[PDB]
Write a protein that holds these residues in place. Structure first.
Motif, PDB file in Angstrom:
ATOM      1  N   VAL A   7      22.374  -8.020-103.409  1.00 40.34           N
ATOM      2  CA  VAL A   7      22.924  -7.607-104.694  1.00 40.34           C
ATOM      3  C   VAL A   7      22.768  -8.737-105.706  1.00 40.34           C
ATOM      4  O   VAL A   7      23.234  -9.853-105.475  1.00 40.34           O
ATOM      5  N   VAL A   8      22.115  -8.446-106.828  1.00 43.12           N
ATOM      6  CA  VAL A   8      21.819  -9.482-107.814  1.00 43.12           C
ATOM      7  C   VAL A   8      21.616  -8.927-109.225  1.00 43.12           C
ATOM      8  O   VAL A   8      20.989  -7.883-109.414  1.00 43.12           O
ATOM      9  N   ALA A   9      22.168  -9.630-110.211  1.00 43.34           N
ATOM     10  CA  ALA A   9      21.939  -9.306-111.612  1.00 43.34           C
ATOM     11  C   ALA A   9      21.072 -10.388-112.247  1.00 43.34           C
ATOM     12  O   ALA A   9      21.512 -11.524-112.419  1.00 43.34           O
ATOM     13  N   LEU A  23      27.569 -17.310-115.173  1.00 44.00           N
ATOM     14  CA  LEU A  23      26.696 -16.248-115.664  1.00 44.00           C
ATOM     15  C   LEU A  23      26.447 -16.386-117.162  1.00 44.00           C
ATOM     16  O   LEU A  23      27.355 -16.731-117.919  1.00 44.00           O
ATOM     17  N   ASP A  30      28.970  -4.246-114.675  1.00 39.87           N
ATOM     18  CA  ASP A  30      28.120  -4.841-113.652  1.00 39.87           C
ATOM     19  C   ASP A  30      28.954  -5.374-112.494  1.00 39.87           C
ATOM     20  O   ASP A  30      28.620  -5.162-111.327  1.00 39.87           O
ATOM     21  N   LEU A  31      30.035  -6.075-112.822  1.00 41.05           N
ATOM     22  CA  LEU A  31      30.941  -6.597-111.805  1.00 41.05           C
ATOM     23  C   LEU A  31      31.580  -5.448-111.038  1.00 41.05           C
ATOM     24  O   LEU A  31      31.769  -5.529-109.822  1.00 41.05           O
ATOM     25  N   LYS A  32      31.902  -4.373-111.753  1.00 38.60           N
ATOM     26  CA  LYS A  32      32.447  -3.183-111.117  1.00 38.60           C
ATOM     27  C   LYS A  32      31.411  -2.574-110.182  1.00 38.60           C
ATOM     28  O   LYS A  32      31.742  -2.141-109.082  1.00 38.60           O
ATOM     29  N   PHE A  34      29.047  -4.186-108.627  1.00 37.67           N
ATOM     30  CA  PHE A  34      29.027  -5.068-107.468  1.00 37.67           C
ATOM     31  C   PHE A  34      30.174  -4.716-106.529  1.00 37.67           C
ATOM     32  O   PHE A  34      29.984  -4.574-105.318  1.00 37.67           O
ATOM     33  N   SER A  35      31.359  -4.555-107.109  1.00 43.74           N
ATOM     34  CA  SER A  35      32.563  -4.252-106.345  1.00 43.74           C
ATOM     35  C   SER A  35      32.429  -2.960-105.546  1.00 43.74           C
ATOM     36  O   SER A  35      32.777  -2.914-104.367  1.00 43.74           O
ATOM     37  N   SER A  59      31.907 -20.785-107.974  1.00 42.75           N
ATOM     38  CA  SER A  59      31.850 -20.048-109.231  1.00 42.75           C
ATOM     39  C   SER A  59      32.946 -18.990-109.338  1.00 42.75           C
ATOM     40  O   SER A  59      33.487 -18.754-110.416  1.00 42.75           O
ATOM     41  N   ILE A  60      33.272 -18.360-108.213  1.00 42.33           N
ATOM     42  CA  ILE A  60      34.296 -17.319-108.190  1.00 42.33           C
ATOM     43  C   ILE A  60      35.701 -17.895-108.019  1.00 42.33           C
ATOM     44  O   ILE A  60      36.653 -17.161-107.757  1.00 42.33           O
ATOM     45  N   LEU A  65      37.570 -11.891-101.908  1.00 40.11           N
ATOM     46  CA  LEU A  65      37.507 -10.554-102.489  1.00 40.11           C
ATOM     47  C   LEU A  65      38.156  -9.554-101.539  1.00 40.11           C
ATOM     48  O   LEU A  65      37.914  -9.589-100.333  1.00 40.11           O
ATOM     49  N   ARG A  68      36.908  -7.199 -98.177  1.00 35.19           N
ATOM     50  CA  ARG A  68      35.604  -7.761 -97.842  1.00 35.19           C
ATOM     51  C   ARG A  68      35.747  -9.139 -97.207  1.00 35.19           C
ATOM     52  O   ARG A  68      36.744  -9.831 -97.416  1.00 35.19           O
ATOM     53  N   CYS A 111      25.096 -11.876-101.745  1.00 34.87           N
ATOM     54  CA  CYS A 111      25.714 -11.670-103.049  1.00 34.87           C
ATOM     55  C   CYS A 111      25.246 -12.634-104.132  1.00 34.87           C
ATOM     56  O   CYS A 111      25.354 -12.330-105.320  1.00 34.87           O
ATOM     57  N   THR A 132      20.056  -5.694-110.807  1.00 31.75           N
ATOM     58  CA  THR A 132      20.598  -5.277-112.094  1.00 31.75           C
ATOM     59  C   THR A 132      19.922  -6.043-113.226  1.00 31.75           C
ATOM     60  O   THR A 132      20.346  -7.142-113.584  1.00 31.75           O
TER      61      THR A 132
HETATM   62  C1  LIG Z   1      29.898 -15.218-109.624  1.00 30.40           C
HETATM   63  N1  LIG Z   1      29.746 -13.923-109.012  1.00 30.40           N
HETATM   64  C2  LIG Z   1      28.470 -13.535-108.444  1.00 30.40           C
HETATM   65  C3  LIG Z   1      27.817 -12.297-109.011  1.00 30.40           C
HETATM   66  C4  LIG Z   1      27.986 -11.980-110.365  1.00 30.40           C
HETATM   67  N2  LIG Z   1      27.392 -10.862-110.841  1.00 30.40           N
HETATM   68  C5  LIG Z   1      26.642 -10.059-110.021  1.00 30.40           C
HETATM   69  N3  LIG Z   1      26.047  -8.931-110.522  1.00 30.40           N
HETATM   70  C6  LIG Z   1      25.315  -8.154-109.705  1.00 30.40           C
HETATM   71  N4  LIG Z   1      24.694  -6.974-110.242  1.00 30.40           N
HETATM   72  N5  LIG Z   1      25.140  -8.440-108.406  1.00 30.40           N
HETATM   73  C7  LIG Z   1      25.708  -9.540-107.869  1.00 30.40           C
HETATM   74  N6  LIG Z   1      25.529  -9.852-106.486  1.00 30.40           N
HETATM   75  C8  LIG Z   1      26.489 -10.391-108.687  1.00 30.40           C
HETATM   76  N7  LIG Z   1      27.082 -11.516-108.187  1.00 30.40           N
HETATM   77  C9  LIG Z   1      30.864 -12.993-108.979  1.00 30.40           C
HETATM   78  C10 LIG Z   1      31.850 -13.076-109.952  1.00 30.40           C
HETATM   79  C11 LIG Z   1      32.923 -12.191-109.936  1.00 30.40           C
HETATM   80  C12 LIG Z   1      33.013 -11.218-108.945  1.00 30.40           C
HETATM   81  C13 LIG Z   1      34.174 -10.249-108.932  1.00 30.40           C
HETATM   82  O1  LIG Z   1      35.109 -10.443-109.692  1.00 30.40           O
HETATM   83  N8  LIG Z   1      34.197  -9.095-108.058  1.00 30.40           N
HETATM   84  C14 LIG Z   1      35.316  -8.185-108.085  1.00 30.40           C
HETATM   85  C15 LIG Z   1      35.212  -7.317-109.294  1.00 30.40           C
HETATM   86  C16 LIG Z   1      36.457  -6.653-109.805  1.00 30.40           C
HETATM   87  C17 LIG Z   1      36.300  -5.330-110.484  1.00 30.40           C
HETATM   88  O2  LIG Z   1      35.488  -5.205-111.435  1.00 30.40           O
HETATM   89  O3  LIG Z   1      36.974  -4.347-110.106  1.00 30.40           O
HETATM   90  C18 LIG Z   1      35.277  -7.332-106.875  1.00 30.40           C
HETATM   91  O4  LIG Z   1      36.301  -6.666-106.532  1.00 30.40           O
HETATM   92  O5  LIG Z   1      34.225  -7.266-106.188  1.00 30.40           O
HETATM   93  C19 LIG Z   1      32.023 -11.130-107.975  1.00 30.40           C
HETATM   94  C20 LIG Z   1      30.947 -12.018-107.988  1.00 30.40           C
END
Ligand SMILES: CN(Cc1cnc2nc(N)nc(N)c2n1)c1ccc(C(=O)N[C@@H](CCC(=O)O)C(=O)O)cc1
Ligand SMILES: NC(=O)C1=CN([C@@H]2O[C@H](COP(=O)(O)OP(=O)(O)OC[C@H]3O[C@@H](n4cnc5c(N)ncnc54)[C@H](OP(=O)(O)O)[C@@H]3O)[C@@H](O)[C@H]2O)C=CC1
Ligand SMILES: NC(=O)C1=CN([C@@H]2O[C@H](COP(=O)(O)OP(=O)(O)OC[C@H]3O[C@@H](n4cnc5c(N)ncnc54)[C@H](OP(=O)(O)O)[C@@H]3O)[C@@H](O)[C@H]2O)C=CC1
Ligand SMILES: CN(Cc1cnc2nc(N)nc(N)c2n1)c1ccc(C(=O)N[C@@H](CCC(=O)O)C(=O)O)cc1
Ligand SMILES: Cc1[nH]c2nc(N)[nH]c(=O)c2c1Sc1ccc(C(=O)N[C@@H](CCC(=O)O)C(=O)O)c(Cl)c1
Ligand SMILES: Cc1[nH]c2nc(N)[nH]c(=O)c2c1Sc1ccc(C(=O)N[C@@H](CCC(=O)O)C(=O)O)c(Cl)c1
Ligand SMILES: O=c1[nH]c(=O)n([C@H]2C[C@H](O)[C@@H](COP(=O)(O)O)O2)cc1F
Ligand SMILES: O=c1[nH]c(=O)n([C@H]2C[C@H](O)[C@@H](COP(=O)(O)O)O2)cc1F
Lengths: 505, 505
Positions: A7-9, A23, A30-32, A34-35, A59-60, A65, A68, A111, A132
């Motif tokens: 998974v990558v943006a 970022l 986008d973060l959603k 990923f989630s 970074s996080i 999470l 997970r 990730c 992404t």
């Molecule tokens: C720094 N980092 C890596 C990161 C950032 N953007 C990406 N974007 C994409 N498309 N794919 C990835 N693998 C990706 N990874 C992050 C930063 C924040 C969260 C994060 O907050 N995740 C929550 C998001 C909360 C929500 O939006 O509900 C989660 O529940 O997974 C994850 C990865």
């Protein structure tokens, strides 16, 4: 065996993913994504493992999470047995022990981390890739996403979405009944052209843009490219008024989204300024071709020349007087046309004004129609209306959708210009009437490709589409005729190089 | 285990298959279909076994079929060991020894015999059914095909084919990757109405006509029925000029074949006579509604009444004077309309005549257009043009295709009438210009269903489509306005019972 997806943006062109330990963008959707894509599982008793680099783990904010298990790759981080949701391995290979042991893991995700991505690809551990693409390149990057090896093939490309005026896509890369098919083939053998299915043959792989994407052709530029392929496949070689013959098919359509993007082709650099200038040239009801030439727009040169006019029986006409064409029928329908210098104020039927007024005073009406086909004026026109008639529709959520019928379509030159033109027009009518852009459906009659555009369009088909740009107005006008080129802002347009194609006069 | 399929050609309604020891029809395409569907195999070292009754074996003249092994079921026929291509068994159950032994057989087919079909279905030995529905019922049968049990479901229905003015279909009955789907669903969860895919949701099974047919929806009535399902699913409940609100969607299309059939709906008995009468009423350029009422056609009654006319600001108008509507714009475009009694001969622009003349003098032209939308006359019309503009196309093999744009579509009343009307019109223009009918593409703007047609259309969706009928002209006319109802021959039309639906005035 267990599935390991990436998974990558990354940015659209240089594939940048980060800058200065963070970022280079902020997209909540986008973060959603990923989630949801990392929380996706079948067994409730299982979880998904998330492999990421140490710097990504920093970074996080070094916080786990939910639902997970984060797997951190580091040569310094101690094996923390305290937190049961986070685990540290010394190398990427040893980290992937989830296959052989730990049946509490259902799926494995990489990730982040360029240093991790690169050796996750180099050692071949990745089965799927969720890319992404983000549409911005005039910024600074320090961390990039490695070029996807040829072992992967795209199988999906979502529509272009918009967040904070930023365009982005969602793509999937994969590492790669008989009875009905057989029956249809047999019927295709018995009946020849009799079977309509054989009249509309599926384009071959050699002329199909990105053949690997079969069921996930969600991007709306495919509405145009697949049409290009269809005309390239079933196009009947026929002659016309010009010396250049075309391959033509009849009865087609293209759909477009205008809510989250702007239907401007990315496989070819389209001259947007000429499109806009021509559009407002129509809106004013101007028929003077010179006004377009003065502004360095030469799209009505061939159909305006003295030779062409004298050839079609209009030798009495001035050097660039195109006659009661588009715009004149919009503002002065059934108006007695003299010359392009005469003042046609108050004369004819102002279709545009009544269209706007009806759009804002009665949105749920079913008569929002702007036409240009006037049998009484066809003989005077330098060129009969191609984009003949349009109809507009105000949805319940205050969106403005546009349908356009086009009798003849030059898929090399005319088509993109028409799409963009009616898109911009729809947006203008939306802003003036206080609505938002919706959908654009273009229904084409004679869809044809000129024989001198073959290599060019076949070259265009060899280009994998990029996310549609955004179009924003810098100011709100009171009159639709007050739009200026400086008021137009095109955001995130990174198209393939321009393709030179000659116009058949 | 080996696949056992049933191959049978039966009539559309009573499912008759034979008469007096022979077939009640002669269709070379059907016999060829049998040949190809029975010769279909993978292994060259294997053959296909054909099980048939004794009387069927007599029907083919008792001569073996090449590259196949005919299995005759008879209690009297001696076990002929001479011919290695024909074998006789005493009963059907014992006849199916091809499973347990003889690995030289790849597939098993039940080719004929009601006595064979019935107990091949009763004892459950059949996996697949290849049904060739034939459109004739006013003849005599003595051998029928048993009703298909509920254990089978249709998965395919070909387009309607024509041989010797006989309509027929080809159907298959069967005894009954996740990643992209998941991704699209997740994106549909994140983005709401923002995602255009969620604005065009796939119709639910409860409102999907014949849900079992998923990939084999080849029949062109599905072009209309699936549209009905789409508006029934995504239809925005909105108001209009009438007191009856509609569920509406915007930007749709339907394709139709006219070469091998005639796009007349079979799920509902459509008044073809009224359609034709209205069509020639248009062609003559007549605007007098009484002329239509005198011939017992009341489709223009509500939009003609004195109350409706006085309501729309035309109280000065006569009891049934509809004004410069369809036909008047076809024959006298931009002509100053007075009353329905005046003689508008020679006045206005005759679009139809010029259309014909251009069609026969310049087929490869791209301006074959007939329009009815006249902004200057809209205020005088009793009802603005719904089927607004049409374009015609002469293919290289001398076929005539028609495209029609429709601003507003009543899927309950207006739609079938429009389809059939422009189909017949296309055929007329084809005969007058010396061509053959081709394809009919209808592009719809406001596709809507009135709220008082819900139960009716939901009833219509519960009916599995039947093959389209055929339309033949009894005589060739010199002028297109000389067509009469007696000159029309509708062959093989066996539709479901009519569905009464009220028109919203
Ligand atoms: C720094 N980092 C890596 C990161 C950032 N953007 C990406 N974007 C994409 N498309 N794919 C990835 N693998 C990706 N990874 C992050 C930063 C924040 C969260 C994060 O907050 N995740 C929550 C998001 C909360 C929500 O939006 O509900 C989660 O529940 O997974 C994850 C990865
Ligand atoms: N757009 C997106 O989807 C994502 C973007 N990013 C961004 O990209 C940047 C992060 O990537 P990047 O700069 O490359 O840093 P990394 O996250 O890739 O760094 C990885 C760390 O893991 C350890 N490590 C890596 N490889 C090995 C190995 N072979 N053996 C042992 N240990 C190893 C190292 O830590 P140690 O010092 O302990 O040895 C290394 O510093 C950040 O800016 C981040 O914001 C990050 C994730 C996703
Ligand atoms: N439209 C189509 O696709 C087809 C149509 N047809 C038509 O159907 C008609 C023929 O069908 P039909 O009249 O029913 O006759 P059949 O084809 O069913 O033949 C029946 C014969 O098979 C033998 N037989 C049948 N059942 C048994 C059994 N349980 N045990 C032993 N022997 C059995 C008997 O022969 P025996 O005298 O030896 O006892 C019987 O007379 C013809 O008109 C033909 O044209 C036929 C095939 C296909
Ligand atoms: C009597 N009879 C049974 C018969 C007739 N029509 C059917 N029609 C259908 N759709 N399905 C059947 N099983 C079927 N069976 C017949 C009659 C002729 C041939 C026949 O001529 N077969 C040739 C066909 C030759 C050709 O047309 O090219 C072959 O090669 O199999 C077969 C079966
Ligand atoms: C008005 C007109 N007459 C036409 N005749 C034929 N055979 N084909 C046509 O497209 C037209 C047109 S519309 C039109 C639209 C764009 C162009 C055009 O300039 N196309 C080029 C150049 C664009 C530019 O930079 O201006 C391109 O997109 O690659 C032209 Cl010549 C005519
Ligand atoms: C001319 C006209 N005006 C309309 N107004 C609304 N709101 N909706 C419409 O479809 C129309 C029409 S077209 C039309 C076509 C067929 C009929 C019609 O009579 N249908 C009948 C069968 C035909 C008959 O025998 O008359 C039915 O389906 O039960 C009618 Cl009322 C109007
Ligand atoms: O917007 C336009 N789009 C377009 O494709 N044409 C092309 C279509 C056709 O190939 C050519 C001439 O039209 P016609 O087919 O009537 O010769 O102009 C013209 C436009 F103005
Ligand atoms: O051929 C026709 N088909 C049709 O669907 N209508 C319906 C469409 C609409 O529901 C109604 C009136 O059109 P409007 O939307 O302008 O009220 O007539 C009328 C015809 F003549």
């Amino acid at each position: 065996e267990k599935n390991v997806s990436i998974v990558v943006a990354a940015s659209v062109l240089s594939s940048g993913i980060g800058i200065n330990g963070q970022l280079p963008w902020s997209i909540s959707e986008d973060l959603k994504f990923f989630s949801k894509i990392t929380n996706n599982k079948c067994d409730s008793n299982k979880k998904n493992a998330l492999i990421m680099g140490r710097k990504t783990w920093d970074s996080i904010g070094r916080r786990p999470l939910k639902n997970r298990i984060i797997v951190v790759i580091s040569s310094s981080l101690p094996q923390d047995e305290a937190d049961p949701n986070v685990v540290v391995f010394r190398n990427l290979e040893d980290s992937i022990e989830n296959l052989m042991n730990d049946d509490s893991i259902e799926n494995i995700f990489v990730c982040g981390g360029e240093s991790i991505y690169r050796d996750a690809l180099k050692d071949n551990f990745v089965d799927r890739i969720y890319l992404t693409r983000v549409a911005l390149e005039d910024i600074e990057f320090d961390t990039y996403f490695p070029e996807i090896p040829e072992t992967f093939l795209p199988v999906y490309m979502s529509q272009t979405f918009c967040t904070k005026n930023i365009s982005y896509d969602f793509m999937i890369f994969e590492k790669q009944l008989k009875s009905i098919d057989d029956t249809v083939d047999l019927l295709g053998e018995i009946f020849g052209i009799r079977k309509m299915g054989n009249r509309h043959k599926f384009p071959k792989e050699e002329i199909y843009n990105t053949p690997s994407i079969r069921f996930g052709r969600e991007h709306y530029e495919f509405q145009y490219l697949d049409l290009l392929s269809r005309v390239l496949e079933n196009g009947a070689y026929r002659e016309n008024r010009t010396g250049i013959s075309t391959y033509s098919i009849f009865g087609q359509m293209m759909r477009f989204d205008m809510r989250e993007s702007f239907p401007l082709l990315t496989t070819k650099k389209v001259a947007i300024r000429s499109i806009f200038e021509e559009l407002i040239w129509f809106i004013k009801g101007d028929t003077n071709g010179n006004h377009l030439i003065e502004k360095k727009v030469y799209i009505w040169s061939g159909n305006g020349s003295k030779e062409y006019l004298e050839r079609i029986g209009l030798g009495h006409r001035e050097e660039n007087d195109l006659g009661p064409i588009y715009g004149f029928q919009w503002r002065h329908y059934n108006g007695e046309y003299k010359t392009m210098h005469d003042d046609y104020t108050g004369v004819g039927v102002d279709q545009l004004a009544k269209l706007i007024e009806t759009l804002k005073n009665n949105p749920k009406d079913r008569r929002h129609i702007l036409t240009a086909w006037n049998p009484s004026a066809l003989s005077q026109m330098a060129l009969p209306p191609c984009h003949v008639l349009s109809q507009y529709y105000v949805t319940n959520d205050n969106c403005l959708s546009c349908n356009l019928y086009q009798r003849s379509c030059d898929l090399g030159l005319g088509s993109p210009f028409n799409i963009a033109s009616y898109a911009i027009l729809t947006m203008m009518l939306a802003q003036v009437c206080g609505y938002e852009p919706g959908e654009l459906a273009i229904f084409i009659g004679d869809a044809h490709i000129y024989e001198n555009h073959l290599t060019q369009l076949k070259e265009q088909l060899s280009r994998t589409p990029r996310p549609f740009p955004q179009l924003k107005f810098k100011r709100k006008v009171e009159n639709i005729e007050d739009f200026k080129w400086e008021d137009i802002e095109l955001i995130g347009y990174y198209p393939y190089p321009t393709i030179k194609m000659d116009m058949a006069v």
